[PDB]
Amino acid sequence: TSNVITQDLPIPVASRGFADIVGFGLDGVVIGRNAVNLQPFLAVKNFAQNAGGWLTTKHVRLIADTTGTGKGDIVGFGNAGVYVSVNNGKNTFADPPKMVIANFGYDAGGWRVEKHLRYLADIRKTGRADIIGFGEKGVLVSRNNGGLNFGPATLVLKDFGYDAGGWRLDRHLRFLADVTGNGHLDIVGFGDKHVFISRNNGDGTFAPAKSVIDNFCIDAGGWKIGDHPRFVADLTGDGTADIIGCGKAGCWVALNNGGGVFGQVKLVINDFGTDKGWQAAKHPRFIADLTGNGRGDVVGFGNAGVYVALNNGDGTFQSAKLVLKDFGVQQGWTVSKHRRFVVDLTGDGCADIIGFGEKETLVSYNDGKGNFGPVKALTNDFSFSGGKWAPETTVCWMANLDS
Amino acid sequence: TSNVITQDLPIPVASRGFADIVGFGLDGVVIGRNAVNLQPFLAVKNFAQNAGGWLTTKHVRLIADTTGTGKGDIVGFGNAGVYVSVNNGKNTFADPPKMVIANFGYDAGGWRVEKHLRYLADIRKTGRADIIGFGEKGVLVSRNNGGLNFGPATLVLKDFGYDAGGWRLDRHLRFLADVTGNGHLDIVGFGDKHVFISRNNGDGTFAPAKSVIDNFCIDAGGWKIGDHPRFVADLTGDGTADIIGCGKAGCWVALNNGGGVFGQVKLVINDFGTDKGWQAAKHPRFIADLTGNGRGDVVGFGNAGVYVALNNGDGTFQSAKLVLKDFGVQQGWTVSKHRRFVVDLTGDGCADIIGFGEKETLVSYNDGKGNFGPVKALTNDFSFSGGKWAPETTVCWMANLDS
């Protein structure tokens, strides 16, 4: 297992735990705490389409531990800066939220959802999240200095930026993961001709970017943003992030030697790629630990239902098989209306499947071996419900509120 | 609300949160973590009747944060000493447990469930639990030095002991609670003729026992152990512990002024006592916050069902009333086979009711005002299921594993 931050999944969820639902609904933040009587709780009247004027087109809304308590706080990147609603521990969130910094906003620093990435991460391993943004001139970091005091937004690396040199959301990928093996989150960038790494030194600095693979990129191997999803994830159990991507012929991986050196790029699964009919607009794919061994498995929501290929434990894989006859295109699930997640809901380290459907939120539980039980109606809440949870106007995440 | 440790409830549960089931079953520690798919998880194959030789008549089995991570660990006072299974933060408990001190055991120091009390509490307020024992010659403490290092068991107070002077379980009550107002757990002892306090200094030392109330005792008002239950809880909202006892004619309180000095003993509820049929063998009673206002309310499981009296906020009460035709004698609930709990399961700060019955574990949710909804079968697990969960051979607590 590696803790990892991607563009699609900026909020790390524990591989072994009881994931909670956090929804930025139309009228505010709705918490669905993983519990015996799941009931949506309107925790904060803000951070919402119809409370505070929050927009998916202009703002970023996340969950992270900004105080160091181990409790996840609500964080919003608004117009004038970053606002935080502190989780008081005992199921209460501060409302109204407090503005902790005049940077990383639409009006503060000219940040744009179309050009930049903003993440929250404990890059210094101090137990609370720094602000890290992939901006114009490079990677800007504001150190979290306790008590919601954030250091100056500081250009810490002149690379991986819209204007340093030429990073684009329609061409490239920028993730954070420990690939060097020092416990700290590094920068992993899929550029034009190479995957680049910038090592996190440990002390709030990143080394200059270095090329590590001549593949997985738009102009090295023909990897395209829509059609060929790429991931970073521990596939060997050594605790460092390997690389895997769903391409044309199937899934290709390059394994980390444990220090950020990558081996040859090999086809490990002849499925999940375009040759077998997997399309970005229809078929969400994920890497998640479905067997509790700390190694990433491949999960895909295909046409007839969900397909999985299990990791043998060493970065090679078994064949893909259909494991669950639901949550697929045949059953009516769509990327534009519905939300699907692959996360542990039950504390056994084997990821379960939950889907926010048209009118119902459904779940199927992993059996502890990578197989799935009968689908069950968990709640009417969080479902699309004719627009109540439209992707255009709401954001939903799984997160461990108690981490 | 005040943090309180009692003989019947040695483990404090949060008044606002999602309490977890922790059961010491026949085959090991079973965690019933409060979650969407509640299932017994055999976490440690020890601490059990048929795993490690653990017995209700010989050993003490608890949950407490021994490491300071905010996560409850499994702790057992066994034969040769105290054993801990650390909770790693990812629903994993060390197995086998490791011994942390060769004392406070049946063989090590001659501790007896029939004679002595053993608690775990953060009496120094450093984020982790010291061991506190009421033994033969007085109060013995072992300082939790971190990393599971425990200091020598030290006789810190020559009072409250089986042989200093004659404290007996058939007769007296010994609790930990903050009654001085200094934020630290004090010793509260219902002796022969007085309620005694021993103030907690801070350094984890206690001042000589001082008489504070001439009442609530076997020789001061005729208070008997089973028949006339006494509790300590915050009934005023100030964070200091008040005192309430269910006498013959109803509930008498003595209110804390906030500095550990008590007002006149007065009758505030005309029910819950032997006069109105309440009996030690049949009708367990509790103080719990049913309204979320931080003041303790009175709950009793009677004949026809559950009765409550709601605190006005200041230690005076509305009249008692039956809120639920269930969990009572007439529905077949007995103290000898079944377990009943009054704890928040839903994080709204209003305590709910859960019961481990004959073949089923049932729940009724507080509506948020002290009323209760229909009883729902939660799971078949943790139920007597003769006699998988016999009280003679197993132990079940509610606890918040994630503080």
Residue numbers in the entry:
A (entry chain A), B (entry chain B): 2 to 404
The authors write:
The structures of AAL2, AAL2-GlcNAc and AAL2-GlcNAcβ1-3Galβ1-4GlcNAc were determined at resolutions of 2.0Å, 2.1Å, and 2.0Å, respectively. There are two virtually identical AAL2 monomers arranged around a two-fold pseudoaxis of symmetry in an asymmetric unit in both the structures of AAL2 and AAL2-GlcNAc, and one AAL2 monomer in AAL2-GlcNAcβ1-3Galβ1-4GlcNAc, while the protein exists as monomers in solution as determined from its elution volume on a Superdex 200 10/300 GL column. As expected from the sequence homology, the structures of AAL2 and AAL2-GlcNAc complex are very similar to those of the corresponding structures of PVL, with root-mean-square deviations (RMSDs) of 0.7Å for Cα atoms. Each blade is a β-sheet consisting of four anti-parallel β-strands arranged in a W-like shape and of about 56 residues in length, and is named W-motif according to its shape. Seven tandem W-motifs of the AAL2 monomer, numbered WI to WVII from N- to C-terminus, are organized around a seven-fold axis of pseudo symmetry. The first β-strands of the seven W-motifs are located innermost of the AAL2 monomer and form a central tunnel that is filled with water molecules and almost blocked by a long N-terminus loop (except for a small opening). These 7 innermost strands point to the same direction, from the ‘entrance’ to the ‘exit’ of the central tunnel, and run almost parallel to each other along the direction of the seven-fold propeller axis. What is notable is that the seven sequence repeats observed in AAL2 do not match exactly with the seven blades, but instead have a shifting of one β-strand. WI consists of three consecutive strands, i.e., strands 2, 3 and 4 at the N-terminus, and one strand, i.e., strand 1, from the C-terminus.
